[PDB]
Paper text:
The trimeric complex of p97-ND1, ASPL-C∆, and METTL21D was crystallized in the presence of SAM, and X-ray diffraction data were acquired at a resolution of 3.0 Å. The crystal structure of the complex contains one molecule each of p97-ND1, ASPL-C∆, and METTL21D. In the active site of p97-ND1, a molecule of ATP is bound, whereas the active site of METTL21D contains a S-adenosyl-L-homocysteine (SAH) molecule. The crystal structure has thus captured the product of the methylation reaction after Lys315 trimethylation and conversion of SAM to SAH. METTL21D is bound to the p97-D1 domain, and the p97 loop, which contains the target Lys315, positions its side chain toward the active site of METTL21D. In the crystal structure, Lys315 is in a trimethylated state, which could be validated by test refinements of all possible methylation states. ASPL is bound on top of the p97-N domain, as described in previous work on the p97:ASPL-CΔ complex, with the lariat structure of the ASPL-eUBX domain wrapped around the p97-N domain. A striking result from the crystal structure is the presence of p97 in a monomeric state within the complex. In the crystal structure, METTL21D is bound to the p97-D1 domain, sharing a large interaction surface of ~1,100 Å2. The residues involved in the interaction belong to the highly conserved SRH motif of p97, including Arg359 that acts as the arginine finger crucial for nucleotide hydrolysis, and Arg362 that contributes to p97 hexamer stabilization.
pmcp97, also known as CDC48 or valosin-containing protein (VCP), is a hexameric, ring-shaped AAA+ ATPase (ATPase associated with diverse cellular activities) that can extract ubiquitinated and nonubiquitinated substrate proteins from protein complexes and membranes. ASPL (alveolar soft-part sarcoma locus; also known as UBXD9, TUG, or ASPSCR1) is a unique p97 adaptor protein that regulates p97 activity by disassembling the p97 hexamer into smaller oligomers. One example is trimethylation of p97 at residue Lys315, a modification introduced by METTL21D (also known as VCP-KMT or NVM-1). Here, we report the crystal structures of a human p97:ASPL:METTL21D heterotrimeric complex and of the plant methyltransferase AtMETTL21D.
Numbering used by the authors:
A (entry chain C): 13 to 223
B (entry chain A): 319 to 333, 336 to 366, 372 to 496
C (entry chain B): 23 to 428, 434 to 461
Amino acid sequence: LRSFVRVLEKRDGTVLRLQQYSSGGVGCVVWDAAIVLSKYLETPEFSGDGAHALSRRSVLELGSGTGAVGLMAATLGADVVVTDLEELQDLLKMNINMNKHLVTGSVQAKVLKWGEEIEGFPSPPDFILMADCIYYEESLEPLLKTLKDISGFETCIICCYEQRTMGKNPEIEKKYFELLQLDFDFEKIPLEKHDEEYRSEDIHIIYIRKK
Amino acid sequence: DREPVVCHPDLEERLWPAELPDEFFELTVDDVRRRLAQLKSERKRLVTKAFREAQIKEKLERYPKVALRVLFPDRYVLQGFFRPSETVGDLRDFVRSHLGNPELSFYLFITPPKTVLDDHTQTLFQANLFPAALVHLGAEEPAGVYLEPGLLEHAISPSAADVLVARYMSR
Amino acid sequence: PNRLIVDEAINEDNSVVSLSQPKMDELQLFRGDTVLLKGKKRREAVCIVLSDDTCSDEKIRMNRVVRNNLRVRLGDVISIQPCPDVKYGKRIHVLPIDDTVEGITGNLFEVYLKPYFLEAYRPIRKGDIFLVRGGMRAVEFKVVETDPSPYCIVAPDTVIHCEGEPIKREDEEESLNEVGYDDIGGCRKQLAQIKEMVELPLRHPALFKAIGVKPPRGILLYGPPGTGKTLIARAVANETGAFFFLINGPEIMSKLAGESESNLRKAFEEAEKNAPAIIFIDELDAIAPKREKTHGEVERRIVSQLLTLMDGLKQRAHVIVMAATNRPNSIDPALRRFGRFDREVDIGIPDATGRLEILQIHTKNMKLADDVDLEQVANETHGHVGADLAALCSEAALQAIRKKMDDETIDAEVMNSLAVTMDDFRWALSQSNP
Ligand SMILES: Nc1ncnc2c1ncn2[C@@H]1O[C@H](COP(=O)(O)OP(=O)(O)OP(=O)(O)O)[C@@H](O)[C@H]1O
Ligand SMILES: Nc1ncnc2c1ncn2[C@@H]1O[C@H](CSCC[C@H](N)C(=O)O)[C@@H](O)[C@H]1O
Ligand SMILES: [Mg+2]
């Protein structure tokens, strides 16, 4: 029984030590979409002018796994709530502990199975982040109903995912955007806007808004 | 004209190269830059008779004068000036002119390794005996005489022979 | 006191170094004159200089023999100057290396030394390692004692003596039988592609960073088995002084989960500790194949461990990962992402000209008869990769050895009197099945 850690270097120099498990679910390892999305938040286009866009703003990460995206936003001043299954809570609590010194905002690990009724989220967050969440039955309808119940009209949803061309993966991606169009308005961010080094022609960052 | 001269190392007149510092062999960023150009130019190498004919003609125009040196087995050097259009047979006649026995069966070769110049009709340009070449001499029945005694009396130093070729190639 | 950059030699002779014509005019050198070469740490050697059109003004071409004596690699800086003046040697003493004469006994002078120095006037300096082909092998010799010392020319009146027992080679003295660029044929274009990518980032990563070119972290080599992918990696690792670490795909995947992950960590730890280094992942399709991703608890995530170890490689690590696969389309897309495996080099099946180069390489030590037509063997070997042609030459040479006599120590003059014929190559071809 052993483990390996991924070092996610920020633009300012500080590194995020993320613990990963060699045996277990898909959320036990840092995926390439989480690396693309984490580095996208550091881009000067996203940071904008003056204080960072995430600074002092609420953000909810759906399907955090290790918590690479949620922890990156927490170091940029945001008020993060990283969510996942009950089995991924010990990893979320561990990664918060390993990088809490770099957190300028706040970060809490909550349980959130897609499709279930919302209990501890009365106010809609300013941001909803997703890293590689489209891949099976739960990504299709239960995930969309969670997005609809949680998000408000001013809530910005950022969905980063890798395009997979084997088995059920391409079918689930097509059905996800077919059902997403019924309630939300998605817009693909050009690859040129992504991080110069950590970007990919097969990894898409999409902006989703309610109504 | 050939302008014949004979030189021997036991005539250098005056006297160990100096050791170089370790900074001399330390590569610079421009040295690394030049190495990258060699690697890129070697990859670039990936033509009909007419192009090779022009390549040869343009090369012959660059060096219209040639300086040859015949290294005898007794460490003596017979130096003569030739033209690229002249043949290996003309070099043999030049050597025979300054031989003690003008009927000796000798052979001229380039090393390393031993590469005999059998084709006497082959020009110096084809035999790569240009612009300055060092050709060795061998004999079927080696005799200490080799050069004629008259030429050995007016023998100059090897350093003076280097002055004679530099002056000849400059003018 | 002129600085030149070391490059591969075109002339295969040991005593020959090539220089550009304008540089020979600049140095006032004669074609065939003796030059004195020196490099780092007081190392010295005397050679014969020849002109070359391919040679650039600031470069010098020398073969592995001169490079090993000067302790220099390709791209190094050396000092050249005319040496006045080398005297003809009175008597020299030469002794072979222990590993180079394993299984050979007898007159090594008649077989190797006599023809090598025969009327060649070769300039040898004390403590020089030189290579002599013959007797179906390449024998290295070391001039233990010279008279006069240290430099002398092996003239026809020089006494050559090879008495004594074979000598032991030092750790600094690397083998001339080791894998180099001169051992690869058929893919000279692919070797030039790779040399441009890895030679400089490995040897001078700080000076290469100032150039502006982004160095590669990983290089993909694809082609059928036995085509020379591993041979190319070993040669680059030796020619640049990089530490070589070989990883087998199905070998690692066969090991139980947990041990296979820890073995990957140890492979990258050894490369990082022994910088610069080249990690060679043979059969990469076994470690990182592309398959559908689903919500299930897997016993081992070996591809995530690979990418985590590759992304953590810094510029101060000096490690380049080269991987080999027969099916490049079956590789996981994450391997070609974020500049991990950035470049792709195709080492494919060689053509008629490429096959002749491999045959010339695998018959450089064996004595061939006049009727032997290597061009004909290359013409009728379609579908043969480098491994097939090397085994063909081994089986053709073994056929000639079997016809004479009937392994143990054989006489040197017996092996030298043996010549491989076309009937031996035709027999090897009738049995060769790629
Ligand atoms: N281009 C080549 N030139 C000379 N020899 C070659 C060449 N390619 C292969 N060989 C010979 O093949 C043998 C080793 O082949 P090698 O391991 O390099 O191939 P490979 O493509 O890596 O396949 P694999 O490792 O799966 O067997 C040696 O005998 C080597 O001399
Ligand atoms: N029904 C469901 N409810 C909540 N989380 C779920 C879920 N189905 C899958 N997940 C979680 O969604 C994630 C998919 S993998 C994404 C891991 C993470 N964002 C990273 O890329 O680093 C896993 O953490 C998995 O546990
Ligand atoms: Mg092999």
